Design a protein around this ligand. Structure first.
Ligand SMILES: O=P(O)(O)OC[C@H]1O[C@](O)(CO)[C@@H](O)[C@@H]1O
Ligand code: NA
Lengths: 422, 567
C-alpha cells in the first residue's frame, strides 16, 4: 500500500532539463580538453589519433595491421582513395615474415626488434615509411615494447597514439560500410567514445586542414566534480570501494563492470526499511561482486512469467515471492534507464557540437556502436536512442552495430579484406 | 592573411631612424626601460614579448626595417636553400660549413650535429661541419677576444675545406661585427668557383661596423657591401632580417641566438625536404617555431616561481646546477657558461651537465639548486635514480612531452610543481621529429635565458636594460662600453673615450701613445680589469676622480646603486 519503492526509484529519475544540463557540462569539459591551455586541467582529455582526413594523402580507413602467432608474422596495409571511376575505393597489401629461431626463443626485446625490422622493410617498399598510419596489433605493455624497439632503431618514429582503441576500430570498421559514420562508441564493461573533429578546432595538433578522430576518454567525466549533484548514495559507495576512487565517475554510472553492484546496494536499501525478502539479507546478497551484471540483462529478458528472474534469486539463496521479484525488475529498470539516459547526454553533446562546426541545419550522420551492455541488454539499446534523438533535433542519426565474428583491431582487418573483394 | 600568423605578433614598437643612429642590435629596447625594478612575473612577460618581436611581420606601410616575414628575406632564404640542395646532390667534394663567434658559433655547432644526424638517418654521408672562433674550447667557455682575428677564421676554414670542390660558408654575426666572419666572406668572393658565402645578421648592412680590422684591409661594412653587390649576380647572399634589440642591451645570445637558430633551421630543413615550390614549406616551419613561443610562455607563472627560487639561492651564496639529457644538456651548458661574461657570476654559479653519450653529486650542498631538464623519450630510470638521491630539497624540473604521453607516478611525487610543456603532433614526413627536436631546444633556451637573465636583474646587477658591470673582454664590447657612457652622461664622444681609456690603463698616466694605440692593445690590458665601467662613469657624473669613486663603491652594496644615486 505504501508505494515507497516508487519514491526510492525516483532517485534514478532524470528529466530532460537535467540531461541537457549534462550535455552542456559535457561539451564544456571536452572543449577544455581540446584547448591547449586547459588540456592538463581537463577531466576529458580528448586525446587525438593518427586517424585523419587530410590533403597530404590521408583518409579515414588508412591503417597498418600487425598480426603475430607461431613463427609467422604478418603485416597489412589498408589504404583508402578514389578509384578509376572516381569511386570510393580500398586497396590492401600483405607480407608475411618468418621469425628466426633465436628471436622467438629469446627475450621480448629480441623479438620486437625483429618486428620493427620487418616493418621498416614493408613500409620502405610501399613508400609509406614516415606517413604516420594508425596502428593495431593483433595476436594468435605490448603497446610500448613496439615503440621502444623503434626508438632504439633509427629508421622512423611513432607516437603513443598510433595504437587505436576499440572505440575507434569500431568507427572505422563501420565507416567502410557507412561512409557517413563519423562517430564511434563503446558501451560494455567500460565506456568511451571517439569522433571526427575539425583539425582547426584541435589545438593539440599541428595543422588546421581537415578533420581528425579524437578519442574523448569521457569516462573521466565528473572527476572535477561536474556531476557532484547527480550522484546518489549508491554512486559514491562504489567509488570508495573501487580500485580507482575519484576517477572514471561517468563510466561508473554506465559501466557494465559496476552496473550489477549498483543494483545490489539498492536491494540492501530495500531490505533495511522495506518489504524486500522480508528483511532477510541473504548470505550471498551481502557479498560484493555477487550480483553480476549478466543478471540485470537476464531479469529484464524475463517474458513476464518470472521464471528467468527466479532462476537468479534461487542462485543467491533467495526464495522470492510474486511481489518482490517484480521490484527487482523495477530496480534494474531504474538503473538501466539512467545508464542509457546518461550515455545519451554525452553522445548528444558530441553530435550537437559536430552540427555547430558544420554549416548544415540538418545533419544526417551515422554512429558506429559496439558493447555488451549495448548489443545484448534488451531494453538499453532502444531507450538510449530515444533520449538521444530528443536531445539532437535536426539530426537524422543512424545507428549501426559492429558485426560479430570480430572483436577489436581485427574487425577492422577483416572488414577491409572483405572490400578489396569489390 | 598574407602570413598565417599563429601567436599574435606584439603591438608594433618604437623603431625608426629618429629613434637612434646606433644599430638596432645595440639599441636600448623601448619595452624594458623599467627592467631593473620589474618583479619576476613582469620580467617573464617582458622578455617573452621581446622574444616574440622576431616573429612580428612588418608594421608600418613603408618598410623601415626588412622584418623576418618580409618578401625579401624569404626570397633570399629560398635562394640560399636553392644553392644548398645543389651541394647536397653532389656530396662528393661537397661540404657545408656554418661559422660564427661565441653563441652564434655555438648554434652552428648545434646545427652541424643535428643536420649530420639527419643525413645519417637517411644513410647519407654527413656533409656538415662547424667553425667556432677559438675552436672547440670556445663552445663551452668564454673566449670572445679570439674573434678579433680575421686570419684565424680563414685559417680554420682552409683546413676543413681542404680537398673539396664546392663549399657553402654561412658566416653568422648578429651584430655584423666579428672580423672572424668578415675575413671568411672576403676570401670566398675571390674564388666563387668553389666558395658560396652567406652572411647572417640582424642589422641593415648600412649599420654594420665600419671600424678598421686589425688584420684586414676591409671593414665589416665594406665586405658585406660587396656581397650585396655580388648577390645581384647570385654568387653570394646577404640575409639580414630585422628582429629588433635585446631585452638586455647587446645580449645577442637571447633573441639573436633564437633568431639565428630559427633562420638556419628553417631554410636548411626546407632544402632537405624539397629534394619545385618550398616557399609554402618554409612558412610551415616558421609557423612551427612560432607555436613554441606560446607553449613555453603559457608557463610564465611557473617560470616566475622558478626565477625566484634560483635568485634566492644565488643571493644566499648558493650554486646552480643544470642537469640536461642529451642535446638539452648542451643547451643548459651554453646558458650557464654565457653568464660569466654577460654578467659577473662565477663559473661555479650556474653550470650545465650532460647525461648520456658521481663527482659533483657527492659534494652537492643544501644551498645549491639543481634543475633537471629532459624529455619523456629519455631514460626515465636514469633520471629517477639521480632524482631520488638528491634530497637538496630545492628542486624543480622542466619536461617536454608529446600529447598522449604521461609522466610516471613516481616522478609526479618527486616534482609536484613540475614545468610541463606539451607539444602538438607533427605530421612532417621524416623531419617531423627533427623539427620536434629543434623547437624543444629553442624552448629550453628561452626558459633558461629568461631565468638566468631574470635571476641577475633581481640582484641589482644591471641598470635600466644595460650590462653596467660589464667586463671589456673584446673590441665589440669596448665600443658597447663607450656607447653606454655617451648614453648615460650625454657628454661628447671625445670626453667619454678619454675617461674610458684612463680607467682601463689606471693607475697609468695619460699619453699620446695611448690615444693613438690600436684597439688590440686596450683589449689585452682591459680584459682582466674590474669595475672599469662604474669607475669611468662616476668620474664623469660628479666631476670627480677614479680614486674618489673607488672609495664610494666599496662602501656601497653594488656599482649599480651608487650610479643610480648619482643620476
Ligand atoms: O653574433 P655576434 O654579434 O658576433 O655575437 C657573438 C657573441 O658576442 C657576444 O655579444 C659577446 O660579446 C655574445 O652575445 C655572443 O656569444
Ligand atoms: Na590544429
Amino acid at each position: 500500500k505504501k508505494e515507497k519503492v516508487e519514491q526510492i526509484l525516483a532517485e534514478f529519475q532524470l528529466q530532460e532539463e537535467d540531461l541537457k544540463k549534462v550535455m552542456r557540462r559535457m561539451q564544456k569539459e571536452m572543449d577544455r580538453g581540446l584547448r591547449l591551455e586547459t588540456h592538463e586541467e581537463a577531466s576529458v582529455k580528448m586525446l587525438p589519433t593518427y586517424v585523419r582526413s587530410t590533403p597530404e594523402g590521408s583518409e579515414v580507413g588508412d591503417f597498418l595491421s600487425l598480426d603475430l602467432g607461431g613463427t609467422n608474422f604478418r603485416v597489412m596495409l589498408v589504404k583508402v582513395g578514389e578509384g578509376e571511376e572516381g569511386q570510393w575505393s580500398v586497396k590492401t597489401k600483405h607480407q608475411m615474415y618468418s621469425i628466426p629461431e633465436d628471436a622467438m626463443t629469446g627475450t621480448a626485446e629480441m623479438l620486437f626488434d625483429y618486428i620493427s625490422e620487418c616493418i621498416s622493410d614493408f613500409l620502405d617498399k610501399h613508400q609509406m615509411k614516415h606517413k604516420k598510419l594508425p596502428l593495431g596489433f593483433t595476436f594468435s605493455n605490448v603497446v610500448g615494447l613496439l615503440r621502444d624497439a623503434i626508438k632504439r632503431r633509427g629508421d622512423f618514429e611513432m607516437d603513443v597514439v598510433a595504437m587505436v582503441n576499440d572505440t575507434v576500430a569500431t568507427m572505422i570498421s563501420c565507416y567502410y560500410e557507412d561512409h557517413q559514420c563519423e562517430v564511434g562508441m563503446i558501451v560494455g564493461t567500460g565506456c568511451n567514445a571517439c569522433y571526427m573533429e575539425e583539425m582547426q578546432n584541435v589545438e593539440l595538433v599541428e595543422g588546421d586542414e581537415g578533420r581528425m578522430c579524437v578519442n574523448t576518454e569521457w569516462g573521466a567525466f565528473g572527476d572535477s566534480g561536474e556531476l557532484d549533484e547527480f550522484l546518489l548514495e549508491y554512486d559514491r559507495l562504489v567509488d570508495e570501494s573501487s580500485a580507482n576512487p575519484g576517477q572514471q565517475l561517468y563510466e561508473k554510472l554506465i559501466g557494465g563492470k559496476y552496473m550489477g553492484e549498483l543494483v545490489r546496494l539498492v536491494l540492501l536499501r530495500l531490505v533495511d526499511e522495506n518489504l524486500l525478502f522480508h528483511g532477510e539479507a541473504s548470505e550471498q546478497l551481502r557479498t560484493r561482486g555477487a550480483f553480476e551484471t549478466r543478471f540485470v540483462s537476464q531479469v529484464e529478458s524475463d517474458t513476464g512469467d518470472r521464471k528467468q528472474i527466479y532462476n537468479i534469486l534461487s542462485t543467491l539463496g533467495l526464495r522470492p515471492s510474486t511481489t518482490d521479484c517484480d521490484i527487482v525488475r523495477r530496480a534494474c529498470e531504474s538503473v538501466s534507464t539512467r545508464a542509457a539516459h546518461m550515455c545519451s547526454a554525452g553522445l548528444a553533446g558530441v553530435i550537437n557540437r559536430m552540427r555547430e562546426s558544420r554549416s548544415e541545419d540538418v545533419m544526417r550522420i551515422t554512429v558506429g556502436v559496439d558493447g555488451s551492455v549495448y548489443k545484448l541488454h534488451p531494453s538499453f539499446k532502444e531507450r538510449f536512442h530515444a533520449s538521444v534523438r530528443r536531445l539532437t533535433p535536426s539530426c537524422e542519426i543512424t545507428f549501426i552495430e559492429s558485426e560479430e565474428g570480430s572483436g577489436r583491431g581485427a574487425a577492422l582487418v577483416s572488414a577491409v579484406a572483405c572490400k578489396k573483394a569489390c | 592573411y598574407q602570413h598565417v600568423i599563429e601567436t599574435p605578433e606584439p603591438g608594433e614598437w618604437e623603431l625608426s631612424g629618429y629613434e637612434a643612429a646606433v644599430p638596432i642590435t645595440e639599441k636600448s629596447n623601448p619595452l624594458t626601460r623599467n627592467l631593473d625594478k620589474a618583479d619576476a612575473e613582469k620580467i617573464v612577460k617582458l622578455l617573452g614579448q621581446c622574444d616574440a618581436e622576431i616573429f612580428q611581420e612588418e608594421g608600418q606601410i613603408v618598410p623601415t626595417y626588412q622584418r623576418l616575414y618580409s618578401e625579401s628575406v624569404l626570397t633570399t632564404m629560398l635562394q640560399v636553400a636553392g644553392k644548398v640542395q645543389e651541394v647536397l646532390k653532389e656530396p662528393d667534394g661537397g661540404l657545408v660549413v656554418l661559422s660564427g663567434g661565441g653563441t652564434s658559433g655555438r648554434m652552428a655547432f648545434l646545427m652541424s650535429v643535428s643536420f649530420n644526424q639527419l643525413m645519417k638517418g637517411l644513410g647519407q654521408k654527413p656533409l656538415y661541419t662547424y667553425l667556432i672562433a677559438g675552436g672547440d674550447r670556445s663552445v663551452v667557455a668564454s673566449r670572445e677576444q679570439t674573434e678579433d682575428s680575421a686570419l684565424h677564421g680563414i685559417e680554420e676554414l682552409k683546413k676543413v675545406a681542404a680537398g673539396k670542390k664546392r663549399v657553402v660558408v654561412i658566416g653568422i654575426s648578429v651584430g655584423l661585427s666579428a672580423p672572424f666572419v668578415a675575413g671568411q666572406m672576403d676570401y670566398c668572393m675571390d674564388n666563387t668557383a668553389v666558395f658560396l658565402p652567406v652572411l647572417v645578421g640582424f642589422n641593415p648592412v648600412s649599420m654594420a661596423r665600419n671600424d678598421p680590422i686589425e688584420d684586414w684591409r676591409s671593414t665589416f661594412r665594406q665586405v658585406a657591401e660587396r656581397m650585396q653587390k655580388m648577390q645581384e649576380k647570385q654568387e653570394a647572399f646577404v640575409l639580414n632580417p630585422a628582429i629588433g634589440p635585446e631585452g638586455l642591451s647587446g645580449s645577442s645570445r637571447m633573441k639573436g641566438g633564437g633568431a639565428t637558430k630559427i633562420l638556419l633551421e628553417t631554410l636548411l630543413l626546407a632544402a632537405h625536404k624539397t629534394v619545385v615550390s618550398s616557399q609554402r614549406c618554409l612558412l610551415e616551419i616558421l609557423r612551427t617555431f612560432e607555436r613554441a613561443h606560446q607553449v613555453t610562455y603559457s608557463q610564465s607563472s611557473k617560470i616566475a616561481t622558478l626565477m625566484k627560487q634560483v635568485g634566492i639561492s644565488l643571493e644566499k651564496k648558493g650554486r646552480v646546477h643544470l642537469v640536461g639529457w642529451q642535446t638539452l644538456g648542451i643547451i643548459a651548458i651554453m646558458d650557464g657558461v654565457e653568464c660569466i661574461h654577460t654578467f659577473g657570476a662565477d663559473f661555479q654559479d650556474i653550470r650545465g651537465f650532460l647525461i648520456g653519450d658521481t663527482s659533483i653529486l657527492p659534494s652537492l650542498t643544501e644551498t645549491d639548486t639543481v634543475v633537471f631538464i629532459f624529455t619523456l623519450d629519455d631514460n626515465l630510470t636514469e633520471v629517477q635514480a639521480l632524482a631520488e638521491r638528491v634530497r637538496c630539497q630545492n628542486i624543480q624540473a622542466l619536461v617536454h612531452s608529446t600529447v598522449g604521453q604521461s609522466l610516471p607516478a613516481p616522478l609526479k611525487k618527486l616534482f609536484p610543481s613540475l614545468i610541463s610543456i606539451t607539444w602538438p603532433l607533427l605530421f612532417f614526413d621524416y623531419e617531423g621529429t627533427y623539427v620536434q627536436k629543434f623547437q624543444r631546444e629553442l624552448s629550453t633556451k628561452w626558459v633558461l635565458n629568461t631565468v638566468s637573465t631574470g635571476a641577475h636583474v633581481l640582484l641589482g646587477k644591471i641598470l635600466q636594460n644595460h650590462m653596467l658591470d660589464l667586463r671589456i673582454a673584446n673590441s665589440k664590447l669596448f665600443w658597447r662600453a663607450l656607447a653606454m657612457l655617451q648614453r648615460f652622461s650625454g657628454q661628447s664622444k671625445a670626453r667619454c673615450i678619454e675617461s674610458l681609456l684612463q680607467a682601463i690603463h689606471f693607475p697609468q698616466p695619460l699619453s699620446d701613445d695611448v690615444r693613438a694605440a690600436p684597439i688590440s692593445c686596450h683589449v689585452q690590458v682591459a680584459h682582466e680589469k674590474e669595475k672599469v665601467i662604474p669607475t669611468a662613469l662616476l668620474s664623469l657624473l660628479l666631476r670627480c676622480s677614479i680614486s674618489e669613486a673607488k672609495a664610494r663603491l666599496s662602501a656601497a652594496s653594488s656599482v649599480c646603486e651608487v650610479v643610480r644615486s648619482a643620476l
